[PDB]
């Protein structure tokens, strides 16, 4: 269906100890393909997917220089933002940046985004029109006025609607055997008696891609969310994801409860029932 | 915008100088160039953001620092031994390809061995002749600045309090008053052509202004004549019926 | 990474076509620029390729064509004006967090068109009434050479082109003066039909 490329940047100040720790990661849909770590020995952007290995050395030179320039800007931002909020010079703070582009099932441009955070809270972000900004507080209005006067959104819009979409299409073509694949979830259910009258029915979903999935429990065909425990979708470590949903049912009525699995890789919605 | 060191400045053999460059454009990236005749702009140092600078192609013999966002001072050490050079400062929003660079006015830095031969210019305006007025119905004024050294001047015409550019052409380079000498003084001429009707109006007030770049108040003068400091020498003329 | 401007000095007559070549050695995506430096002015952006139409129109009737397949950004103008006399710089940025790279530049000299040449030599007296004077050789054709002085006691400037924009009149001129005794304006420009008052 739809696809997306996203880049994540994190900078954490170490006051007095030296330069900020900097980690950058790139993803196409749910797959990481590049990384940079300021504490690594290579000091270079590194591959993380087999299909990005096709790029020549000039690719990795340009990507390394650009990602290091990101960390330089964040280093100055950490000093600037400390002054905006009248914070001590000894406290450790965090800057986070995320941007990328979405495309539809026909690989045409769908939307772009570019968001910025300080200490885990929204600071400033580009609007869907890719022409104006959303300032989260009064300190970020100063940045908004600075970025509006410099027409920063015009440069970002050229990347998001252009370069971002063009290389996302290139990545989907070079890695079509893994990016354009759909791994259907392999499902199963477990049963464990809680007490003499209760039982736990856990609905499992393993080794699926992409990560988007839905697990719902029904009592007699009607959705139930009373005693339904649901954990976050987790990575398996091999490019696929895992997820389970559990419910505590009265012992002897397990044949009424049903688990419904919805995933892009399933031609039909799966229905699970404990006998 | 961008403001840098004066258009002209000189140094002594063994002395270091610092060329300033400032911008209030809130730009992150700043640049220093040397414009060599035949080689174009050659990058000396560039700074993509405060506290960060990188060497260019001819960084040898030069030194910079970026402690504030607004300032990017370039210091020319004594190891740099070009007798004359023209330095250009530039800034841009970021180092990104989408951001063009905005250039300062420029600075020519020469090596002046002895300040004894520094002199300010003498300015004189020469009125149009009646022969040209009757022959072509036009009037050409000629301004002449003489006896200055070094050739660091900037000539401008002023008509009724306003600087004029139309009908004005100035010699691209001064000539030597003693062309066989290496420390000869220089002379410079300029012309302002105006209609015969305009010159024949007595109300019209013409003025030739020459800005001379010489010694500063921080310099030391130990001679008999007046200190040839940076000054403006002018000469006026009025219309004649 | 380099930028090549082939011709370093171009001489053109007025109303002629201008074509300044530019090529770059970088092989990836680029942004391209043309800067102009008029005599006595600061370097300023003439036009730029941001994105979109390869044929980029600019100010003063200038146009550039971005040919991605041939790595060229040639600058064109169908009819050069005299006011186009300046130095033109090509510039290309490689999107690799590297500084913008300029070409060596091309000096453009536009031969001024003198419609009604009326060569003459006039004598101009000092405004301060000091009995000092200069000689003015003006209104001659643009293909007339003003040779330098043949005597260090005589000073002769190069030819100079002014433009009275309010009247659409361009004229050449050169100034001569000397502190000698026998120096006269009838003998000043004898080193180069002319009207002598």
């Amino acid at each position: 269906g739809s696809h997306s490329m996203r880049y994540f940047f994190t900078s954490v100040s170490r006051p007095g100890r030296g330069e900020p720790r900097f980690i950058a990661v790139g993803y196409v849909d749910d797959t990481q393909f590049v990384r940079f770590d300021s504490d690594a020995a290579s000091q270079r952007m590194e591959p993380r997917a087999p299909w990005i290995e096709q790029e020549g050395p000039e690719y990795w030179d340009g990507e390394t220089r650009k990602v290091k320039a990101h960390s330089q800007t964040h280093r100055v931002d950490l000093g600037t933002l400390r002054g905006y909020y009248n914070q001590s010079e000894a406290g450790s703070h965090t800057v986070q940046r995320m941007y990328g582009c979405d495309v539809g099932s026909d690989w045409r441009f769908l939307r772009g985004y570019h968001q910025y955070a300080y200490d885990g809270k929204d600071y400033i972000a580009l609007k869907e029109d890719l022409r104006s900004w959303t300032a989260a507080d009064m300190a970020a209005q100063t940045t908004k006025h600075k970025w509006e006067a410099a027409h920063v959104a015009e440069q970002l819009r050229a990347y998001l609607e252009g370069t971002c979409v063009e290389w996302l299409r290139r990545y989907l073509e070079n890695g079509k055997e893994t990016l354009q694949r759909t791994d259907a979830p392999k499902t199963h259910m477990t049963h464990h008696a809680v007490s003499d009258h209760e039982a736990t029915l856990r609905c499992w979903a393993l080794s699926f891609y992409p990560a988007e999935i839905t697990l719902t429990w029904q009592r007699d065909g009607e959705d139930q969310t009373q005693d339904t425990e649901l954990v976050e979708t987790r990575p398996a470590g091999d490019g696929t994801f895992q997820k389970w949903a559990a419910v505590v049912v009265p012992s002897g009525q397990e044949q009424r409860y049903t688990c419904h699995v919805q995933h892009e890789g399933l031609p039909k919605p799966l229905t699970l029932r404990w006998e | 915008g961008i403001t840098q060191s004066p258009k002209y400045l000189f140094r002594k053999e063994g002395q270091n100088v610092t060329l300033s460059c400032e911008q209030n454009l809130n730009h992150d990236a700043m640049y220093w160039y040397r414009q060599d005749p035949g080689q174009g702009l050659r990058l000396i140092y560039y700074s993509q953001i405060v506290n960060d600078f990188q060497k260019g192609d001819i960084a040898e013999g030069y030194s910079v620092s970026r402690e504030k966002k607004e300032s990017f001072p370039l210091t020319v050490t004594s190891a740099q031994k070009n007798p004359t050079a023209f330095y250009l400062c530039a800034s841009s929003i970021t180092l990104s390809s989408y951001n063009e660079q905005f250039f300062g006015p420029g600075t020519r830095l020469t090596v002046l061995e002895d300040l004894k031969n520094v002199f300010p210019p003498e300015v004189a305006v020469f009125e149009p002749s009646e022969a040209e007025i009757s022959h072509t119905q036009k009037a050409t004024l000629v301004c002449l600045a003489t006896g200055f050294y070094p050739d660091h001047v900037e000539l401008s015409w002023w008509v009724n309090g306003k600087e004029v550019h139309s009908g004005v052409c100035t010699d691209p380079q001064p000539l030597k008053e003693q062309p066989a000498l290496n420390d000869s003084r220089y002379a410079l001429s300029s012309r302002l052509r105006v209609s015969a009707t305009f010159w024949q109006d007595p109300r019209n007030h013409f003025r030739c202004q020459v800005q001379f770049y010489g010694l500063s108040e921080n310099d030391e003068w130990t001679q008999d004549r007046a200190k040839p400091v940076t000054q403006i020498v002018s000469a006026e003329a009025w219309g004649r019926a | 990474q380099s930028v090549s401007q082939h011709n370093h000095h171009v001489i053109l007559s007025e109303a002629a076509s201008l074509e300044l070549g530019c090529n770059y050695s970088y092989g990836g995506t680029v942004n391209l620029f043309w800067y102009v430096q008029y005599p006595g002015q600061h370097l300023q952006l003439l036009l730029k390729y941001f994105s979109g139409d390869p044929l980029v129109k600019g100010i003063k009737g200038f146009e550039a064509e971005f040919i991605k397949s041939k790595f060229s950004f040639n600058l064109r103008k169908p009819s050069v004006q005299w006011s186009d006399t300046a130095e033109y710089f090509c510039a290309v940025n490689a999107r690799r967090n590297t500084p913008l790279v300029f070409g060596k530049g091309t000096r453009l000299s536009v031969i001024a068109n003198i419609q009604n040449p009326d060569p003459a030599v006039y004598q101009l007296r000092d405004s301060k009434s000091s009995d000092k004077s200069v000689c003015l050789f003006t209104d001659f054709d643009s293909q007339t050479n003003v040779s330098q002085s043949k005597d260090s006691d005589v000073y002769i400037t190069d030819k100079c082109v002014l433009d009275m924009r309010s009247m659409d009149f361009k004229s050449n001129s050169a100034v001569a003066w000397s502190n000698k005794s026998d120096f006269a304006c009838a003998n000043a420009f004898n080193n180069s039909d002319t009207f002598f008052p």
Binding site: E63, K66, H70, R97, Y123, V152 | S96 | -
Partner: peptide, 9 residues
């Protein structure tokens, strides 16, 4: 590929 160097806050 990443975008180019961003403008400081």
């Amino acid at each position: 590929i990443t975008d180019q160097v961003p403008f400081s806050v």
